């Protein structure tokens, strides 16, 4: 097994239904990587979707996309197949942890990392693709504080007990690709995720779960697209405009990645 003989497992980065992401160190070069191990049935339609995503990722080359190193399938003894995808390890945390540590206070940085997410999103989009998985836990920063878009994959969580609405990854998922009214996945979906991601980028960390659920669900309202009182039309204004344009219920009223880059609302690089 190539994984256990060539790589030194260092730390678990993520876990879930997909499988896991591990911080590893190649024994030969000595660099750290984020190897994604997915348990697969090489006969299933699931295998056709991952092999299809490995093909697409190996063809993506952008400064703001997470770098692809290698992908291989391994067969394990009687407890079975595993698919490994070796990708770059972005040393300087995720965008999630960058927001939680006060990104909002540094407007100059805030606007730079946003532009970078747009550059990489534009590249993905101009190569005719939809990400479907743009969330702060899947956008990272390297040693040089650059954005690296990751690869592609009522509420008990509320301590007050009174909150209703969507929670987690669902808060980033476009309204058109939800419910019974499943109005076809578009590239405009990736831009809805980016309008939620930019609000969080532009707003103070939401310390409590009750605060996060209320604030993000009120922003997602088609009959009331919010913005908290402390997110004033005075000091933000252009930020509020970008967020409101991207979060426009009508998938057709949303800009293109290139439209927002060639827009006056975004400061110059």
Closest CA to 38 of 55, 52, 23, 50: 50
Angstrom distance (rounded) from CA 140 to CA 129: 20
Residues touching ligand 38O, count (CB under 6 A) = 16
CA distances 59 to 21, 120, 129, 142, 165, Å, are: 21, 14, 12, 21, 38
Q: Is 83 in the site for ligand 38O (CB under 6 A)?
A: no
Closest CA to 198 of 250, 261, 244: 244
In the set 19, 97, 217, 261, which binds ligand 38O (CB under 6 A)? Answer: 97
Task: Compute the Cα dihedral for 110, 112, 113, 119 and give only its sign.
Answer: positive
Q: Is 120 in the site for ligand 38O (CB under 6 A)?
A: no
Q: Check residue 138 and report its DSSP letter.
A: G
Q: Is 135 in the site for ligand 38O (CB under 6 A)?
A: no
Q: Which pair of structure tokens corresponds to residue 87?
A: 């990708």
Q: Which residue has the tokens 């690709």?
A: 177
Q: Is 21 in the site for ligand 38O (CB under 6 A)?
A: yes
Residue 143 or 223: the one with the smaller Cβ distance to a second copy is: 223
128 binds, among a second copy, ligand 38O, none (CB under 5 to 8 A by kind): a second copy
CB 220 within 8 A of CB 166: yes
Q: Check residue 71 and report its DSSP letter.
A: E
97 binds, among ligand 38O, a second copy, none (CB under 5 to 8 A by kind): ligand 38O
Angstrom distance (rounded) from CA 184 to CA 238: 30
Per-residue mark of binding to ligand 38O, 33-72 (x: CB under 6 A): -x-x-----------------------------x------
Binding site for a second copy (CB under 8 A): 45, 48-49, 51-53, 55-56, 59, 127-132, 152, 154, 158-165, 184-187, 208-211, 214, 217-218
Q: Is 89 in the site for ligand 38O (CB under 6 A)?
A: yes
In the set 37, 56, 73, 93, which binds ligand 38O (CB under 6 A)? Answer: 93
105 binds, among ligand 38O, a second copy, none (CB under 5 to 8 A by kind): none
Q: Check residue 104 and report its DSSP letter.
A: G
Q: Which residues bind ligand 38O (CB under 6 A)?
A: 13-14, 21, 34, 36, 66, 87-90, 93-94, 97, 140, 150-151
């Amino acid at each position: 097994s190539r994984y256990f003989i060539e790589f030194e497992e260092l730390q678990l980065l993520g876990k879930g239904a997909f499988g896991a992401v591990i911080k590893v160190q190649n024994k030969l070069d000595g660099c750290c990587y984020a190897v994604k191990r997915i348990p697969i049935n090489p006969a299933s339609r699931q295998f056709r979707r991952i092999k299809g995503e490995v093909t697409l990722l190996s063809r993506l080359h952008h400064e703001n996309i997470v770098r692809y190193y290698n992908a291989w399938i391994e067969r394990h003894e009687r407890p079975v197949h595993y698919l490994y995808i070796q990708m770059e390890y972005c040393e300087k945390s995720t965008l999630r942890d960058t927001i939680d540590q006060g990104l909002y206070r540094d407007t100059v940085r805030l606007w730079r990392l946003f532009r970078e997410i747009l550059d990489g999103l534009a590249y993905i989009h101009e190569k005719g693709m939809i990400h479907r998985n743009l969330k702060p836990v899947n956008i990272f920063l390297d040693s040089d504080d650059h954005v690296k878009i990751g690869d592609f994959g009522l509420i008990k969580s509320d301590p007050s007990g009174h909150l209703t609405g969507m929670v987690g990854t669902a808060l980033y998922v476009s309204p058109e690709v939800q419910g019974s009214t499943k109005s076809a996945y578009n590239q405009k979906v990736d831009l809805f995720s980016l309008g939620i991601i930019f609000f969080e980028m532009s707003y103070h960390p939401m310390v409590t779960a009750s605060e996060r659920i209320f604030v993000l669900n009120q922003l997602r309202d088609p009959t009331s697209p919010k913005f908290p009182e402390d997110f004033d039309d005075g000091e933000h204004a252009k930020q509020k405009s970008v967020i409101s344009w991207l979060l426009n219920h009508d998938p057709a009223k949303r800009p293109t990645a290139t439209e927002l880059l060639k827009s006056e609302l975004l400061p110059p690089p």
